[PDB]
Design a protein around this ligand. Structure first.
Ligand SMILES: COc1ccccc1[C@H](NC(C)=O)C(=O)N1CCC[C@H](C(N)=O)C1
Ligand SMILES: [Zn+2]
Length: 139
């Protein structure tokens, strides 16, 4: 679990959005596993606007942060789960690092701010949904 809170927005994994997230929907994209909802309070996070390929992510299944080198956002095949059919997920960045079911929502940050959130994983891999192209989160 986990979310990004920026301005009057909350960014979560679409497959983990709550009834309240859907009732206050701003934007969602099943192909990216993202959903943004509106909030009444001002957020705590700021968003990176960069091309960094290294950073640090939070891994809830280890209660620890780990450094990672990650690929550029791209279209990557993701096998079927209880939440989605087998499909291509877009704006996804892969890295080598621990992740297991439950780790979605952990934030990935570089020196410039929030880069994205954990969205996929498996066998020593971790995939992050990028948010750096969502320029409207800042306005
Ligand atoms: C962090 O996720 C994992 C990590 C290691 C192993 C497995 C997983 C997850 N598999 C299960 C069965 O929970 C996983 O990758 N996803 C499930 C939730 C939706 C995700 C998506 N973006 O399509 C895909
Ligand atoms: Zn950066």
């Amino acid at each position: 679990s986990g979310a990004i809170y920026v301005g009057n927005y909350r960014v979560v994994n679409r497959h983990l959005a709550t009834h309240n997230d859907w009732a206050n929907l701003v934007w969602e994209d099943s192909s990216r596993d993202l959903l943004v909802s509106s909030t009444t309070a001002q957020g705590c996070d700021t968003i990176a606007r960069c091309d960094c390929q290294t950073g640090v992510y939070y891994c809830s299944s280890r209660r620890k942060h780990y450094p990672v080198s990650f690929s550029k956002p791209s279209l990557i095949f993701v096998e079927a789960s209880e939440y989605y059919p087998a499909r291509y997920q877009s704006h996804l960045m892969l890295a080598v690092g621990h992740s297991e079911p439950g780790d979605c929502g952990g934030i990935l940050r570089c020196q410039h701010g929030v880069v994205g959130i954990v969205s996929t994983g498996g066998n020593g891999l971790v995939g992050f949904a990028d948010v750096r192209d969502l320029l409207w989160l800042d306005e």
